[PDB]
Structure formats: C-alpha cells, structure tokens
Ligand binder design. Structure first.
Ligand SMILES: *[C@@H]1O[C@H](CO)[C@@H](O[C@@H]2O[C@H](CO)[C@@H](O[C@@H]3O[C@H](CO)[C@@H](O)[C@H](O)[C@@H]3O)[C@H](O)[C@H]2NC(C)=O)[C@H](O[C@@H]2O[C@@H](C)[C@@H](O)[C@@H](O)[C@@H]2O)[C@H]1NC(C)=O
Length: 496
C-alpha cells in the first residue's frame, strides 16, 4: 500500500511520538544495482525515512572508514519482537477494531516493522490485573483442574492469531512462567522468597514439568504452537526476601537438576519434543557462571538449546566478560535477549512520551548484543497505558506503543522506530559478519548478510556531533554518507 507519514506530537520530551487512531497510522510502501538504500530516524523527527545513494568504485580521504569483512561469519539471527502480557492485551483490545488492526500491523506486517517473535507469559505476572495460575486448585498433583482462563482464551490467544494472520514472515512464540501454583512452593505464595518444595526428580518437580506440557497442549488446542520455552522467568528473583512480583526461585544447581531430571525428559517425551528449551532467562551478569553449572552436566546439557538474558543489570556486566566469554566456552548454545524495557528503576519516570534517549537505549543494547553473538532481542510489553500499566504491583514501565483508551488513539515512540531499524531489515537467518573501523569513533554499528547474500548495516550515533563516514564493501564499492548527531540509520545493498 501507499506509505503514510508520521503525525508528530510533542509531549515536552526530547522528541516526538507518531499519533495513530482508528483511521490513520504511519506505514511503509511494500535498491537497483550499484545503489544503496538508507533508512534514517533522527531526534528532530525523521521516522525511518527512505533515501538512496550510489555505490562508488573508489574512495580517497582521511575520514572514518567502516570496512565490511563478509568472510568473517558469526551468529545467525532468530529474530525480534515483544511480549503479549495481559496488560498489553487489555490495552490493545481497549481500542476500536480498526485501531487495533493498525497497532498490530505496525508491529507484525511488512507495511510495519516485521516482528517475528511473541513472548507469552505462562499465567500471571506483574503485568496482569489479578494473580492466578493455570492450576490453583490446591494439591491437584494430577493437574485434573489445569485450565486456561479468559486472559488466555479471550485476550491473548485471539490477539496472537491476528498477529500471525497479519505477518508475512513466520512468527515464533516463546513461553515463560513467573510462578507455579502456590501449593508447589515452599512459601505458599505467588511472590516472595520461595522455590518448588522438595528436590528435582520428586513429585513436586514432576508435577511442575507436567504443567509446561499441559500449557503447550492447551495452546495447541487453540491452534498455537511454540518455538521455545524458558525454564523460569528470572529464577534468581525467588531467592530474594520479599521479592514483590510473581517468581519461583532456582539456584543454578537447582535449575541444572530440574532440567536434567524433570523438565528435559518430560518435554522430550511429549508431542512437544521439538519445542526448544532456554535456560537462565535472567540478568547477563549471571554468565558465564550459570552456563558452566548447567551445561557441564551432560544430563542437563542434552536438553538445553539456548540461554536467555534480560537487560536490567547490564551496567554491572560488560558484554565481553559475560556474553563473549559464554560464547567462547559454549559456542553451540545460542544466546538470546528475551526481555528489556526502560522506566523500571525506582527513580525513573515510567513513561516519557517521545523520549529519544529511550530509543537510543534500545538500539545501543541491540547492537551491543549482536556484536557479542546474541541471536535476537525481545521487548517486554507490546503496549501500555500512559501510566505504564496496568500492573497489580504498580511496577509501571515504558513501552514502544502507548494506548490512550478514552481517545481511541495510540502513540508510537522513538523506541518503536529504533527497534524497527533492526526488526524490519534483519530477517530470520541473517548472519552477522565482520565490520572494522579505521579510527576511534562514537558510533555503534553492526553488519549482517541476509539469507540472499545482500548486506545490511545499522549505525547509531551516540554523540551530538555529525560524523561523515564511508562504508567499504571489499570488491563491491564504497558508500559515502553522514551520520547526524543522535541519529540511527539502516543501510541495505545488493552485493551482486
Ligand atoms: C486520525 O488521525 C488523522 C491524521 O492525523 C486525522 O485526520 C487528519 O485531520 C487533520 C487535522 O484535523 C487534517 O489536517 C488539517 O488539514 C487542513 C488543510 O486541508 C488544515 O486547515 C488543518 O489545519 C489541518 O492541518 C488532515 O487532513 C487529516 N488527515 C487525513 C489523512 O485524513 C483524524 O482527524 C479526523 O479526521 C479529519 C479528516 C478531520 O475531520 C478531523 O476533524 C478529525 O479529527 C484522526 N481521527 C480522529 C477521530 O481524530
């Protein structure tokens, strides 16, 4: 279809949001040889704007040069997306159906930014308006009274279907639990410090592993299948006195033994044996320690496909010492970023409508992650209200889309576009390749090759200063460009 431009609105922060409603949302149209395409977003308000340029045979000058190394091959990309929490579903469904469609297309359509991953909580988390699990009848070890409530069957499931219908690209679903039923837990509550009762290999752990199969059976009854599940959301959280949100504590040895004795075998012996299992699903500072504990046990390692990480304590955890070292030790176990959002520290404003800085936090993380072997990157809530909710613990945060229910309006923030500079232009199966710089610079940049062999480079300028630069593709040519202060650019070219 015809592209329609951003309707910009300022709320007094560093950049604009794009305003969408029942009848209008910004969108894309559905390069020739020896030309490149450039998509640009800026603080000043350009939103993924297309231009084109020539690929040159020669280059001279002393300016910054970024040189592709297409023969230095790294990880293959799984993809990008966000989470269908109860809060995200409530927000989306509060819009009239045509506005809902435009919000879903923004994310999932080729006319939008081409998301291909949806994270699905297994029952309630803090972004739910009530606490529940799928098996709250006490001591139901048989799981006879396991069932999906309306949060799944009326809210999440129909919206996931609609997302799949709108997507051209195959979409992968990823499930994560926050808490077990409370009668499986040491403390008998959905939150707080508490783990499963007993020990791996016992009735409580066998029941909890069966619950994952029951979940997958129930979604399959609604014609949804999962790419992957994680072994627990933030297992370390349930180790902490008073922890306020739904949780279930595991030490790395506890997770090791649960996977080996219970969760791995139980999944492998089900119709769902092709579903991937990811471990950790927690802060990357826990690496490489947690990978060493779990993956040096061959009974556990045989069931673990990958390692999921969250971004929240990245300031404690340089990527080289965590992601880089884990890759060096366990190169065959993919690293995957499974949850991120801004606005979640006690001192931060939950929602800052139009924040350019929060957009840059997303793209800087994604590039840093890609440069250290990570195969994909998942946002948290797909949409929230202007308060950053709803959330039963009032742990409000920011989201790339903010829904204004009384106005049948939604706002696409800088975060949406910064994510889209990756999701739209890096399909599943793309491969990160080498890229080196001729001098020290303030840019974050990453190069990948599409399944068809074409090139994609994303460049984020972290500084206020415009930086002229050249991209060298060896034996193909040079791109002469400029990266404006604060901007993010994606470059694409066919290498034939
Ligand atoms: C949903 O969002 C769209 C896009 O923002 C709204 O339609 C747009 O309304 C604008 C402002 O009302 C229109 O711009 C105006 O144009 C004239 C010049 O021709 C100027 O005099 C004036 O100052 C504005 O600049 C714009 O044309 C229009 N865009 C499109 C593509 O239709 C829409 O607003 C609703 O519909 C429009 C057509 C008007 O009837 C508005 O009163 C009405 O709010 C948004 N829908 C809702 C319910 O707000």
């Amino acid at each position: 279809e015809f592209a329609r431009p951003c309707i910009p609105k300022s709320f007094g922060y560093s950049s604009v949001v794009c305003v969408c409603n029942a009848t209008y949302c910004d969108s894309f149209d559905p390069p020739a040889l020896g030309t490149f395409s450039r998509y640009e977003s800026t603080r000043s308000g350009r939103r993924m704007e297309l231009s084109m340029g020539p690929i040159q045979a020669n280059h001279t000058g002393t300016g910054l040069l970024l040189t592709l190394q297409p023969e230095q091959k790294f990880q293959k990309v799984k993809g990008f997306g966000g989470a269908m929490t109860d809060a995200a579903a409530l927000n989306i469904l509060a819009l009239s159906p045509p506005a809902q469609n435009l919000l879903l297309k923004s994310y999932f359509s080729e006319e939008g930014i081409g998301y291909n991953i949806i994270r699905v909580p297994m029952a309630s988390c803090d972004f739910s308006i009530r606490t529940y699990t799928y098996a709250d009848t006490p001591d139901d070890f048989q799981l006879h009274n396991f069932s999906l409530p309306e949060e799944d069957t009326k809210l999440k499931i129909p919206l996931i279907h609609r997302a799949l219908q709108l997507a051209q690209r195959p979409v992968s679903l990823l499930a994560s639990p926050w808490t077990s039923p409370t009668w499986l837990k040491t403390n008998g509550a959905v939150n707080g410090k508490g783990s499963l009762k007993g020990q791996p290999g016992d009735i409580y752990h066998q029941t909890w592993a069966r619950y994952f199969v029951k979940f997958l059976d129930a979604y399959a009854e609604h014609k949804l299948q999962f790419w992957a599940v994680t072994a627990e959301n933030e297992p370390s959280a349930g180790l902490l006195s008073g922890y306020p949100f739904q949780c279930l504590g595991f030490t790395p040895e506890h997770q090791r033994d649960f996977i080996a004795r219970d969760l791995g075998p139980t999944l492998a012996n089900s119709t769902h044996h092709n579903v991937r299992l990811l471990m950790l699903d927690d802060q990357r500072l826990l690496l490489p320690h947690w990978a060493k504990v779990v993956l040096t046990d061959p009974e556990a390692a045989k069931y673990v496909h990958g390692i999921a990480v969250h971004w929240y304590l990245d300031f404690l955890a340089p990527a080289k010492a965590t992601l880089g070292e884990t890759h060096r030790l366990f190169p065959n176990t993919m690293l995957f970023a499974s949850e991120a959002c801004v606005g979640s520290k006690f001192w931060e404003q939950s929602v800052r409508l139009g924040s350019w800085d929060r957009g840059m936090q997303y793209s800087h993380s994604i590039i840093t992650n890609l440069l250290y072997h990570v195969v994909g990157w998942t946002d948290w809530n797909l949409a929230l209200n202007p308060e950053g909710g709803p959330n039963w613990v009032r742990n409000f945060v920011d989201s790339p889309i903010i829904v204004d229910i009384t106005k049948d309006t939604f706002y696409k923030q800088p975060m949406f576009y910064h994510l889209g500079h990756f999701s739209k232009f890096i399909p599943e199966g793309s491969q990160r390749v080498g890229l080196v710089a001729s001098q020290k610079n303030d840019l974050d940049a990453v190069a990948l090759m599409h399944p068809d062999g074409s090139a994609v480079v994303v460049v984020l300028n972290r500084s206020s200063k415009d930086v002229p630069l050249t991209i060298k593709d060896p034996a193909v040519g040079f791109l002469e460009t400029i990266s404006p202060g604060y901007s993010i650019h994606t470059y694409l070219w066919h290498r034939q």
